[PDB]
Structures are given as structure tokens and as C-alpha cells.
Amino acid sequence: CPEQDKYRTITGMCNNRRSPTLGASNRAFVRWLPAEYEDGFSLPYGWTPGVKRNGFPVALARAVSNEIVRFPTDQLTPDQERSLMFMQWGQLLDHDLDFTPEPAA
Template sequence: MRALACFCRDHPRWGASNTALARWLPPVYEDGISEPRGWNPHFLYHGVPLPPVREVTRQVIEVSNEAVTEDDQYTDMLMAWGQYIGHDIAFTPQSVSEAPFGGGADCQLTCENRNPCFPIQIITLRDYVPSILGPEAFGQHVGPYKGYDPTVDPTVSNVFSTAAFRFGHTTVHPVVRRLNASFQEQPGLPPLSLQDAFFSPWRLLKEGTPATLLSLPPQGGAWPP
């Protein structure tokens, strides 16, 4: 059975809020405390230092901007939703929703099927995950909801949050377009490269948010359906 607090009775800490990410392997630090592997260039592995993590990433998944083509099936809403749930899973949400407090419900205290908590699950499992995995893989590995399983630990793992789910960064388009209400390029607001768009919150204040938000649905294909 499941408790009113939404937790498994036998394992009440499984999937609980404000708990640490699960580890699949024991931590390995160069100094035994906190230094990540490769931090100290003088620390050798099999006689050689580890390459910088950034260099490993660049060599493995580097893609030139010229090789990026617009998807004819999915829009940038797919990327935006992945970013939204990714930060929520990693305990770094962009903002705290005040919507549930208006009706007296708190997502951390209730399992009531209402906004904004419940729709997040619906959109993620109905639209986002099948679009990422594809219908065949989704049907094989996820499939329709079969009911609550008290033997499954829903705790988010650090290897998923900090490694596997980082794939979403590859769905970010290298160019950010700012559009008007007719979904045409906004005069005076030319397209931005990511290096000019990232870490530039002043643009939202001086150039406005509508032009950027309007670029999410039309840029690419037609997700969500």
C-alpha cells in the first residue's frame, strides 16, 4: 500500500523530497574526500594523467553548427520541456510554482491530482518520453501504466541526473530566433547564437520575453502533437 504522504510504507525514504541522489557505485575521489578524478594533473592513472572532462566530452559528442539541421517533427518545446523537468529532477528548479498555494495544496504534502503537479507527469510520460525513446523502445521498456509497484525505488540516481540525462543539451538549437505574434522575425531583434543568448538575463528585461517564448513552438517541427 501507499501512504497518504505518497511514500512506500516499507521504504518511506524512497523517492522522498529533499533527500540525496542515489549512488549506483561508491564515490571515487582523488584525495579521498572531494576532489574529482583528473582534478590533480600530477595524479596518474596507469602512468598517465586523465584528460580534462571537457575535452572528453568534446571528442565524444562534438557536432559542428553546420551539421545541425532543424527537426521536421519536433519543435524547441521538446528541448524546453526537457530542460524544465531536468532541473526539477536535479533539484535545481528555475523557479518555485506558487499555483498550488492559491488553492491550498502543496505538491510536497499532497498526492491530489491537480495543477501543476499532475500535468507534469502526464505531459512527460504521454508526450516527452515517447518522443525521446521512440514508440518501439517506449512500448518495450516503459509501456502503459500498470499500477503502483512498491518494489521499485523511484529515487533519482546521480548517474542519471548528472550524466545520462545531460543528453538533453544536444537538443538545444544553436540559434535562438525572436519572433513576433505572426511568428515572423522581430524587427530589431536578430537571431542570436547560443554564446550570445546564454547567461544574458538582461535580454529578458530589455528585449522582452514574448519574442523568445514565441520562438519555441515554430522552431523545428510540431511537438507537442
């Protein structure tokens, strides 16, 4: 890494001089807890029919959404103390921090 620098690299490389890829693009995420997979290392919970997670059947994501998340739109509670700009700055900020690639068709 150059021992003198005035500007950030575009890729984020060299920000940390001791470990130059920390924060740089196209690198694995850091994990705060070890991953929990159906087979221990790659298959997601809900992959194999009948296989339980920690003693319980895996709830279909759409079923959870239909039972807990669903509500009548015309009853929406407006936030008195937040502008819709508060929502939008968050997504613009999220797009500065992370993009998880997935394979193209």
C-alpha cells in the same frame, strides 16, 4: 506515516510506507555504481596536478569540449522529426526530478 492519505505530501515523504524518505527532498542520491574519487572518498579526478586516472592523465573538461564538442553554428542540422518543444519539455521535466545544491558565495 498516516495509515490513510488522499494526497501526496509536498516533500515526497511517506510515499513509500516502509522507507518514508525514498523520493523525498533534501536526501542523498542513490548510487548505481560505487563512486570513483582521486583519493577514494572525496577529491575529484583532475584535482591534484600530475595524478592519473586508471593509468592515464586526466583530460581538461574545456579541452575535451574544444576538441570533440565544438562545431560551426551556421552548419547546424535541424531535426525533421522533433519540435523545439521536445527540448523544452525535457528541461521542465528535469526540474521536477533533480536540483543538486551547491554552496552560495
